[PDB]
Amino acid sequence: TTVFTRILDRLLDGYDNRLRPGLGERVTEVKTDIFVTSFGPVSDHDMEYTIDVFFRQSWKDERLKFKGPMTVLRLNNLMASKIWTPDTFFHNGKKSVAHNMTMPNKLLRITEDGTLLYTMRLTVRAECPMHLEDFPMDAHACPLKFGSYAYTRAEVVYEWTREPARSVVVAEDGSRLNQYDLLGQTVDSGIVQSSTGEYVVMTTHFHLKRKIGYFVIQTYLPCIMTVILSQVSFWLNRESVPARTVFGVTTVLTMTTLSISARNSLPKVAYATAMDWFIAVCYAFVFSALIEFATVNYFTKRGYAWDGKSKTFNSVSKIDRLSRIAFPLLFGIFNLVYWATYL
């Protein structure tokens, strides 16, 4: 075991971890790949998502060549902090955790050629700005960008280990999403310019699509059936003023209860989304149905309804006959225009 011990001590003799490999001589080329163990929950309220990854970085440091019986060396967590590693960070990260239980979840392997494979298990919260105008029928490409914080592209350049599509791998059971479907991913790279210089950025976009079955059964169907119910009032006789006033007013209250709860699920955004417009139209349809009856009652003459046997009786309102067709049709048209637009 002496031979293994000696090599470790000799490696860091004069090694300066403040200087990148090839400083002032060439450009350090870091090869990266990611294995997504679990694509964590997405928070619409905070407009962020969690992702658990094995972040692998590979680069060459000629200062760490060695010769010995073995061809691969495993470095202790203390040894890894003693050498130079890329100062990679996530541009859109909000608060990230490098797990340290029970030991540091890192691993630094050195090959005799001088190539270093450096893996760490991370939990990352990342910013995913969302345009929620199509909510709940919206799709997003949540990004995950990383690069060197301090080194410009003249000093450190990042590349994917293999074909960009195959460099990011998502575990088969790794989808931990409730309201989204991970359709796929596109992996790209480019240059981003800031006030300090030009930096290389590696980008991965996860394309998410919101599942709508929840909002169909929680919001859309109750709203549609209450609007239909508010229109069912049109088929009652015009002489039942208390019944049609109770009918119309309580459907307004039902819309208020549905509208209030429907917006609790929505993130607290101050602009209008596709569900707000649908509820606003349903609110206007329910409001108009009670205004429709108010006009019918103004032209009602006799306070008694048809007795069922035969003295004169009120005639079926012409407002009602038209409203039994116009109101369902206008709502029907609105639904086709609404759904064809967003679907």
Binding site: P41, V246, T250
Partner: protein, 330 residues
């Protein structure tokens, strides 16, 4: 105390934490046993559970063999930072920590033959992907995955020290919402392109308690749905009474449905409870529509027949819906 003090200083002098026991020889076998303290939380929104346990690791290191002391040295927890310990981690662990009051909740115990016992008191939040389609009648299988980070089976091996008895304290677990039905220990090797890695798995099966949802969710929904049938026994000409009853049951059902959405967690997809609430909402929706057809067919144009048939079909179809519902979920 001086004799033991010099005995310990002898062990650490020349110790190399960077080399595993029996370095270059056969793999070091590490036995593990867990004494579960509690499962503090189980959250569907985050899809994880919080676990407190005593995590023990047991292996043999010849470099730590000591003679002359016929006692098992229980040392201060700070000595653990100067020895070799396995690089064990929990694969599905979202966040965890070792308790630190009053001191760090860590234990090292040496034995004369070089055997090391290493215990940690850990609270961990472990990821548990849950299938909540049958919620609240669902049964969950939440696991804890134990693996080596940077060693293969050529260097380290894992096993449950004590067979199926390696995990105790499961009867101590008191989850208000679940009951521990079973637990298992699995030992396996995970083969990747880079080699084979030791794996230990501890898994629990959880059965959710349904009684609260019977009293809180199902019974009120059943009683409101039954209440909507009181309309069928009222006169066809009692428009104010029958509309007020029907429309207020719809409002009551929405109140139950919308406010239940707040007490219950934010799980954004259709579950078993959603299908029952949506089923009862459709029934009360149809009861209100039932009178409209009666009201229209009378004033707009038999009448006793529709009420008579509704007095039977509505209770019968709801019973059939329940029969199909509970068989498909129980």
């Amino acid at each position: 105390m001086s004799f033991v003090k010099e005995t310990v200083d002898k062990l650490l002098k020349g110790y190399d934490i960077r080399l595993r026991p029996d370095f270059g020889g056969p793999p070091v076998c590490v036995g593990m046993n867990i004494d579960i303290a509690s499962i503090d939380m189980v959250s569907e929104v985050n899809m994880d559970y919080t676990l407190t346990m005593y995590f023990q690791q047991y292996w043999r290191d010849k470099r730590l063999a000591y003679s002359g002391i016929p006692l098992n040295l229980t040392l201060d927890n700070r000595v653990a930072d100067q020895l070799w310990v396995p690089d064990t981690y929990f694969l599905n662990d979202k966040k965890s920590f070792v308790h630190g009051v009053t001191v760090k909740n860590r234990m090292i115990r040496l034995h004369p033959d070089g055997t090391v016992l290493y215990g940690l008191r850990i609270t961990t939040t472990a990821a548990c992907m849950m299938d909540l389609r049958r919620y609240p009648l669902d049964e969950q299988n939440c696991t804890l995955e134990i693996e080596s980070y940077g060693y293969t089976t050529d260097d380290i091996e894992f096993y449950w020290r004590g067979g199926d008895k390696a995990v105790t304290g499961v009867e101590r677990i008191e989850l208000p919402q679940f009951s521990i039905v079973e637990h298992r220990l699995v030992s396996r090797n995970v083969v990747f392109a880079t080699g084979a890695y030791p794996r230990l798995s501890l898994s629990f099966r959880l059965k959710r308690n349904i009684g609260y949802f019977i009293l809180q969710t199902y019974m009120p929904s059943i009683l409101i749905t039954i209440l909507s049938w009181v309309s069928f026994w009222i006169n066809y000409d009692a428009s104010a009474a029958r509309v007020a009853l029907g429309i207020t049951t719809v409002l009551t059902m929405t109140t139950i449905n919308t406010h239940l959405r707040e007490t219950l967690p934010k799980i954004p997809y259709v579950k078993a409870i959603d299908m029952y609430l949506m089923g009862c909402f459709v029934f009360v929706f149809l009861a209100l529509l039932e009178y409209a057809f009666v009201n229209y067919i009378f004033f707009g144009r038999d009448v006793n027949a529709i009420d008579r048939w509704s007095r039977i079909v509505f209770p019968f179809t709801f019973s059939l819906f329940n029969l199909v519902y509970w068989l498909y979920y129980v």
